[PDB]
Design an enzyme around this catalytic site. Structure first.
Site, PDB file in Angstrom:
ATOM      1  N   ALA A  12     -49.188   5.099 -67.088  1.00  0.00           N
ATOM      2  CA  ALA A  12     -47.778   4.766 -67.237  1.00  0.00           C
ATOM      3  C   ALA A  12     -47.040   4.886 -65.908  1.00  0.00           C
ATOM      4  O   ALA A  12     -46.301   3.982 -65.514  1.00  0.00           O
ATOM      5  CB  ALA A  12     -47.151   5.678 -68.281  1.00  0.00           C
ATOM      6  N   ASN A  33     -59.229   3.585 -61.025  1.00  0.00           N
ATOM      7  CA  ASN A  33     -59.220   4.475 -62.174  1.00  0.00           C
ATOM      8  C   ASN A  33     -60.649   4.843 -62.583  1.00  0.00           C
ATOM      9  O   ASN A  33     -61.502   3.967 -62.730  1.00  0.00           O
ATOM     10  CB  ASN A  33     -58.507   3.807 -63.321  1.00  0.00           C
ATOM     11  CG  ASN A  33     -57.983   4.815 -64.345  1.00  0.00           C
ATOM     12  OD1 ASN A  33     -57.094   5.620 -64.060  1.00  0.00           O
ATOM     13  ND2 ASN A  33     -58.563   4.788 -65.538  1.00  0.00           N
ATOM     14  N   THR A 148     -41.868   7.394 -68.801  1.00  0.00           N
ATOM     15  CA  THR A 148     -42.587   6.148 -69.046  1.00  0.00           C
ATOM     16  C   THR A 148     -43.812   6.460 -69.877  1.00  0.00           C
ATOM     17  O   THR A 148     -44.443   7.507 -69.687  1.00  0.00           O
ATOM     18  CB  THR A 148     -43.008   5.475 -67.751  1.00  0.00           C
ATOM     19  OG1 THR A 148     -41.933   5.590 -66.823  1.00  0.00           O
ATOM     20  CG2 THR A 148     -43.331   4.018 -67.955  1.00  0.00           C
ATOM     21  N   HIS A 213     -41.115  23.391 -68.721  1.00  0.00           N
ATOM     22  CA  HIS A 213     -42.281  23.463 -69.604  1.00  0.00           C
ATOM     23  C   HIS A 213     -42.854  24.868 -69.660  1.00  0.00           C
ATOM     24  O   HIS A 213     -43.370  25.301 -70.698  1.00  0.00           O
ATOM     25  CB  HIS A 213     -43.337  22.467 -69.136  1.00  0.00           C
ATOM     26  CG  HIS A 213     -43.029  21.054 -69.486  1.00  0.00           C
ATOM     27  ND1 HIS A 213     -43.989  20.068 -69.501  1.00  0.00           N
ATOM     28  CD2 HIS A 213     -41.852  20.440 -69.775  1.00  0.00           C
ATOM     29  CE1 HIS A 213     -43.435  18.916 -69.836  1.00  0.00           C
ATOM     30  NE2 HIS A 213     -42.137  19.115 -70.006  1.00  0.00           N
TER      31      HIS A 213
HETATM   32  N1  NAP Z   1     -45.380   9.682 -67.840  1.00  0.00           N
HETATM   33  C1  NAP Z   1     -44.310  10.330 -67.615  1.00  0.00           C
HETATM   34  O1  NAP Z   1     -43.282   9.915 -67.988  1.00  0.00           O
HETATM   35  C2  NAP Z   1     -44.368  11.594 -66.808  1.00  0.00           C
HETATM   36  C3  NAP Z   1     -43.322  12.513 -66.851  1.00  0.00           C
HETATM   37  C4  NAP Z   1     -43.438  13.626 -66.079  1.00  0.00           C
HETATM   38  C5  NAP Z   1     -44.541  13.813 -65.299  1.00  0.00           C
HETATM   39  N2  NAP Z   1     -45.510  12.950 -65.290  1.00  0.00           N
HETATM   40  C6  NAP Z   1     -46.637  13.236 -64.396  1.00  0.00           C
HETATM   41  O2  NAP Z   1     -47.367  12.097 -64.090  1.00  0.00           O
HETATM   42  C7  NAP Z   1     -48.658  12.213 -64.571  1.00  0.00           C
HETATM   43  C8  NAP Z   1     -49.193  10.922 -65.079  1.00  0.00           C
HETATM   44  O3  NAP Z   1     -48.665  10.516 -66.269  1.00  0.00           O
HETATM   45  P1  NAP Z   1     -49.068   9.182 -66.871  1.00  0.00           P
HETATM   46  O4  NAP Z   1     -48.266   9.183 -68.004  1.00  0.00           O
HETATM   47  O5  NAP Z   1     -49.053   8.097 -65.984  1.00  0.00           O
HETATM   48  O6  NAP Z   1     -50.490   9.556 -67.386  1.00  0.00           O
HETATM   49  P2  NAP Z   1     -51.557   8.642 -68.028  1.00  0.00           P
HETATM   50  O7  NAP Z   1     -50.976   7.505 -68.594  1.00  0.00           O
HETATM   51  O8  NAP Z   1     -52.407   9.379 -68.824  1.00  0.00           O
HETATM   52  O9  NAP Z   1     -52.315   8.107 -66.797  1.00  0.00           O
HETATM   53  C9  NAP Z   1     -53.047   8.758 -65.828  1.00  0.00           C
HETATM   54  C10 NAP Z   1     -54.099   7.835 -65.269  1.00  0.00           C
HETATM   55  O10 NAP Z   1     -54.981   8.623 -64.587  1.00  0.00           O
HETATM   56  C11 NAP Z   1     -56.252   8.638 -65.146  1.00  0.00           C
HETATM   57  N3  NAP Z   1     -56.706  10.022 -65.207  1.00  0.00           N
HETATM   58  C12 NAP Z   1     -56.389  10.901 -66.112  1.00  0.00           C
HETATM   59  N4  NAP Z   1     -56.997  12.032 -65.839  1.00  0.00           N
HETATM   60  C13 NAP Z   1     -57.746  11.900 -64.775  1.00  0.00           C
HETATM   61  C14 NAP Z   1     -58.652  12.745 -63.973  1.00  0.00           C
HETATM   62  N5  NAP Z   1     -58.903  14.022 -64.276  1.00  0.00           N
HETATM   63  N6  NAP Z   1     -59.220  12.170 -62.934  1.00  0.00           N
HETATM   64  C15 NAP Z   1     -58.979  10.940 -62.615  1.00  0.00           C
HETATM   65  N7  NAP Z   1     -58.181  10.168 -63.300  1.00  0.00           N
HETATM   66  C16 NAP Z   1     -57.549  10.563 -64.365  1.00  0.00           C
HETATM   67  C17 NAP Z   1     -56.130   7.992 -66.489  1.00  0.00           C
HETATM   68  O11 NAP Z   1     -57.262   7.364 -66.995  1.00  0.00           O
HETATM   69  P3  NAP Z   1     -58.013   7.939 -68.233  1.00  0.00           P
HETATM   70  O12 NAP Z   1     -57.161   7.909 -69.316  1.00  0.00           O
HETATM   71  O13 NAP Z   1     -59.037   7.100 -68.394  1.00  0.00           O
HETATM   72  O14 NAP Z   1     -58.406   9.207 -67.800  1.00  0.00           O
HETATM   73  C18 NAP Z   1     -54.925   7.107 -66.302  1.00  0.00           C
HETATM   74  O15 NAP Z   1     -55.131   5.846 -65.787  1.00  0.00           O
HETATM   75  C19 NAP Z   1     -48.577  13.284 -65.610  1.00  0.00           C
HETATM   76  O16 NAP Z   1     -49.794  13.910 -65.843  1.00  0.00           O
HETATM   77  C20 NAP Z   1     -47.621  14.204 -64.980  1.00  0.00           C
HETATM   78  O17 NAP Z   1     -48.256  14.937 -63.964  1.00  0.00           O
HETATM   79  C21 NAP Z   1     -45.436  11.863 -66.004  1.00  0.00           C
HETATM   80  N1  O77 Z   2     -38.950  15.696 -69.941  1.00  0.00           N
HETATM   81  C1  O77 Z   2     -38.804  16.377 -68.681  1.00  0.00           C
HETATM   82  C2  O77 Z   2     -38.460  17.832 -68.830  1.00  0.00           C
HETATM   83  C3  O77 Z   2     -36.955  18.014 -68.824  1.00  0.00           C
HETATM   84  N2  O77 Z   2     -36.433  17.677 -70.100  1.00  0.00           N
HETATM   85  C4  O77 Z   2     -35.017  17.706 -70.176  1.00  0.00           C
HETATM   86  C5  O77 Z   2     -34.459  17.823 -71.583  1.00  0.00           C
HETATM   87  C6  O77 Z   2     -34.863  16.801 -72.583  1.00  0.00           C
HETATM   88  C7  O77 Z   2     -35.681  15.740 -72.392  1.00  0.00           C
HETATM   89  N3  O77 Z   2     -35.728  15.142 -73.535  1.00  0.00           N
HETATM   90  C8  O77 Z   2     -34.973  15.765 -74.378  1.00  0.00           C
HETATM   91  N4  O77 Z   2     -34.452  16.768 -73.797  1.00  0.00           N
HETATM   92  C9  O77 Z   2     -34.542  19.030 -69.636  1.00  0.00           C
HETATM   93  O1  O77 Z   2     -35.108  20.082 -69.847  1.00  0.00           O
HETATM   94  O2  O77 Z   2     -33.566  18.988 -68.956  1.00  0.00           O
HETATM   95  C10 O77 Z   2     -40.095  16.265 -67.952  1.00  0.00           C
HETATM   96  O3  O77 Z   2     -41.134  16.450 -68.570  1.00  0.00           O
HETATM   97  O4  O77 Z   2     -40.077  15.941 -66.760  1.00  0.00           O
END
Ligand code: NAP
Ligand code: O77
Ligand code: NAP
Lengths: 425, 425
Positions: A12, A33, A148, A213
């Site tokens: 994402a 990937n 996302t 978290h």
């Molecule tokens: N998405 C958000 O909105 C959000 C919000 C806050 C923080 N984040 C941060 O961004 C990170 C990524 O989120 P995302 O939602 O993009 O995750 P995701 O959709 O699960 O995607 C991560 C990508 O990396 C690969 N991957 C997963 N684990 C791996 C590993 N150990 N080694 C190599 N590749 C790996 C996945 O493939 P496979 O599925 O095949 O492993 C996938 O293509 C989160 O883990 C977090 O640290 C995201």
């Molecule tokens: N979602 C964030 C963590 C921060 N969340 C927000 C609160 C919230 C999000 N949705 C409903 N309430 C916060 O605590 O201010 C992340 O994982 O980066």
């Protein structure tokens, strides 16, 4: 400029970044990937002519666009020295594995590496894992700048962004780094303000998930929902008994913010005002609930006031106070994000969702790092042991043979020791 | 011991009380309802054979019964001297009027007068109006002990009790008064615990609405809903922006409790622990939201802790935390009680609902009484001013010719002076 850009991990986050990168103009855009079901589906979609697609939800639908990928690799052996910029879009707890697994003998031309969701020590850990003489600059973005999700894993290249942060922070392993300005521009394209800071750790100390978290989702209520298979999952941002937020969780949040602040000071970085950070950079509430004076004065207000204000803030967000009111006067239920729970993988082994496995691993490493600065961090340790005890009882009940080994406790001290050595060079 | 009982104000409260009286054992049962459309329907219903009919809803189905009315008057002057007990079940704002209207010089058989919803000073005010030598004891109940309503004005003497309180307090104008024990047993038949206190003002100071309605429903947000014609009405117990509860309103609540408590003390009454009173006498929350030691220690906590605890209490009650959870893990939305708003009466004139009109009137008297004890009560006065300014602008916009006279200014000093004179007697 950015030159040719390789995205590592195509999820994402990568799809949001790809959009922003293609607005700015990258040159070639690739992605790597690791092998697996997702990679397989991606290759089939790309071979059928698909492109990356991003949907903005609600008031974010102006962000919607499509972006083309030039090359996709589910096999590092096909990578050649064609890339100037690497963007790590993998979970942050995998950065070490991913950096070790990359074929650096074939990536000598890489001059920048961006960590999109860094934590305290990530920049140093990645650098300790680079090959000798590597002169890629390592960049730490404070948090991912949006919210996302891949809607349907059957369409692995379509993502939906439901929210966008007002502001994030960006540090670099190289002083006065010109690359920060490029990334400021790239992310500005989707409405986000990128604030450059003099140090990677200063940016890493503004990672919002470490502060939120850790106290909320490493506690008893959260783990009980997460480790459960029967009953309702509960809600991540509601008050007890619908969710994990209690005065005690708020106290944990305050006390951990103080500990993390002391660590940042010992690494030469300015701590943040937690309430102003949450309100101003992530999501606000009205002055009636949080006066501007109370926000700006938070760090000086004293523990009881600080905890009252944090609790009010989360109570004020049980709904979205700026959403449109309904006919009855209700606002959108912003707090109803269900907890994701354990599930069985394709081998029948229980696996933990990224909340809280990723949050646990980040904090365990930060705690182990802090011991090198003679900082005990008892509140962090209390949250670690709460997670450890809950997961251990889940293995007891379930049976070890049923559980993926990521559920077992991991030793953060080698990585902390490499971070600290990197810091003392 | 009760003798013949005259119920003054034959409404919902009176019907419940009649059935409790008959369960315990009483003499003849009479009623005095002043002239009006309701008395007309009562008279016709009585002519057609109607009884007082109580129905208990659900849990309370066992409360249901019928009771005959042996006498019905509308004109106080027609009362014969055959009444040992009077029960005032009219709005408390009419207690003075009622007592002044009764021909006490030929009611020498009255031994007990019970005020069912007594405000601070009500006992003394009622005694103010009795002729010298009158030997009737005045009893003060802290508040009505149920929630009861006449379903259909079409069947005027049929009432519905949907819930019964946990506990009320009863004090008597006569020290160590006998009839206090009788009334404790009578009301215990409904399931309420009645706690005799040593003076009338000790019980009058344990009316919950004085402490809660004043800060919440005399403020700017609640009056904007109440005086609103169009738009959703909002919710009385939700947080801003869906309801009136904010940190500021909680500050008002704490400060008004301080002011009331000092008044009670100057009057010879032991004040209450607000947090304990809300949790233990009205609706509880779990230990993880409000620790018992925090509840019990509230009075000694310090203002900031006290305000935090009060806010936690109302935030914890946004849903009923002891209600069963649904499939999604949600609890009953206990906080969505819509504001009742202004409406035009029979004659076309704007009327305010009992909340906040009765609350304003009660607080106006308390402030005027307090002046005699050298207590300024600025928080109480700020709330009175907010009500007066809001209602004043509503009259401006709609025109006084369109507004019922109950909206116009009131002067409670004459009643305050008589309470004080009686108290110093
Ligand atoms: N998405 C958000 O909105 C959000 C919000 C806050 C923080 N984040 C941060 O961004 C990170 C990524 O989120 P995302 O939602 O993009 O995750 P995701 O959709 O699960 O995607 C991560 C990508 O990396 C690969 N991957 C997963 N684990 C791996 C590993 N150990 N080694 C190599 N590749 C790996 C996945 O493939 P496979 O599925 O095949 O492993 C996938 O293509 C989160 O883990 C977090 O640290 C995201
Ligand atoms: N979602 C964030 C963590 C921060 N969340 C927000 C609160 C919230 C999000 N949705 C409903 N309430 C916060 O605590 O201010 C992340 O994982 O980066
Ligand atoms: N019902 C409850 O659950 C409940 C809960 C909490 C508090 N209370 C309090 O208890 C009080 C009584 O409530 P209620 O529900 O019984 O109200 P209600 O249904 O209004 O009954 C009041 C009765 O008294 C009559 N009355 C009013 N003024 C009178 C007077 N001066 N002389 C003689 N009769 C008079 C009314 O007649 P008209 O209609 O003709 O005026 C009516 O029949 C209320 O003011 C309320 O604040 C009630």
């Amino acid at each position: 400029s950015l030159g040719n850009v390789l995205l590592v991990g195509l999820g994402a986050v990568a799809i949001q970044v790809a959009l922003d990168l293609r607005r700015h103009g990258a040159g070639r855009l690739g992605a790597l990937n690791h092998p697996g079901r997702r990679s397989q589906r991606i290759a089939e979609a790309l071979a059928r002519g698909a492109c990356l697609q991003l949907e903005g939800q609600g008031q974010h639908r102006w962000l919607s666009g499509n972006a083309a990928l030039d090359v996709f690799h589910q096999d590092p052996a096909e990578l050649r020295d064609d890339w100037q910029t690497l963007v790590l879009c993998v979970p942050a707890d995998s950065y070490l594995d991913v950096v070790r697994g990359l074929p650096w003998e074939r990536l000598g031309g890489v001059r920048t590496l961006l960590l999109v969701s860094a934590f305290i020590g990530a920049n140093l850990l990645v650098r300790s894992a680079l090959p000798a003489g590597c002169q890629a600059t390592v960049l730490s973005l404070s948090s991912y700048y949006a919210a996302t999700k891949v809607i349907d894993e059957t369409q692995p290249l379509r993502a939906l962004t439901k929210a966008v942060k007002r502001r994030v922070y960006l540090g670099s392993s190289r002083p006065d780094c010109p690359a920060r300005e490029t990334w400021r521009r790239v992310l500005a394209g989707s409405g986000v303000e990128v604030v450059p800071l003099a140090t990677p750790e200063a940016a890493e100390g503004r990672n919002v998930t470490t502060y939120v978290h850790s106290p909320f989702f490493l506690g008893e209520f959260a783990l009980a929902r997460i480790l459960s298979e029967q009953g309702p999952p509960g809600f991540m941002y509601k008050l007890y008994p619908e969710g994990p937020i209690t005065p005690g969780a708020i106290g944990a949040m305050r006390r951990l913010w103080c500990e993390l602040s002391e660590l940042l000071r010992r690494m030469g970085a300015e701590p943040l005002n937690l309430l102003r950070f949450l309100n101003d950079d992530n999501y606000p509430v009205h002055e009636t609930m949080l006066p501007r004076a109370s926000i700006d004065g938070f760090a000086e207000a004293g523990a009881e006031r600080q905890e009252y204000l944090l609790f009010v803030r989360y109570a004020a967000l049980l709904v979205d106070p700026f959403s449109p009111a309904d006919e009855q006067g209700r606002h959108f239920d912003f707090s109803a994000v269900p907890f994701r729970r354990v599930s069985r993988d394709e081998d029948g082994l229980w696996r933990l969702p990224r909340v809280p496995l990723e949050d646990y691993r980040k904090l365990a490493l930060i705690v182990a790092l802090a011991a090198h600065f003679d900082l005990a961090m008892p509140q962090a340790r209390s949250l670690l042991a709460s997670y450890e005890n809950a997961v251990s009882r889940f293995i007891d009940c379930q049976g070890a043979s049923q559980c993926h080994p990521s559920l077992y406790p991991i030793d953060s001290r080698p990585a902390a020791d490499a971070i600290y050595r990197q810091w003392c060079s």
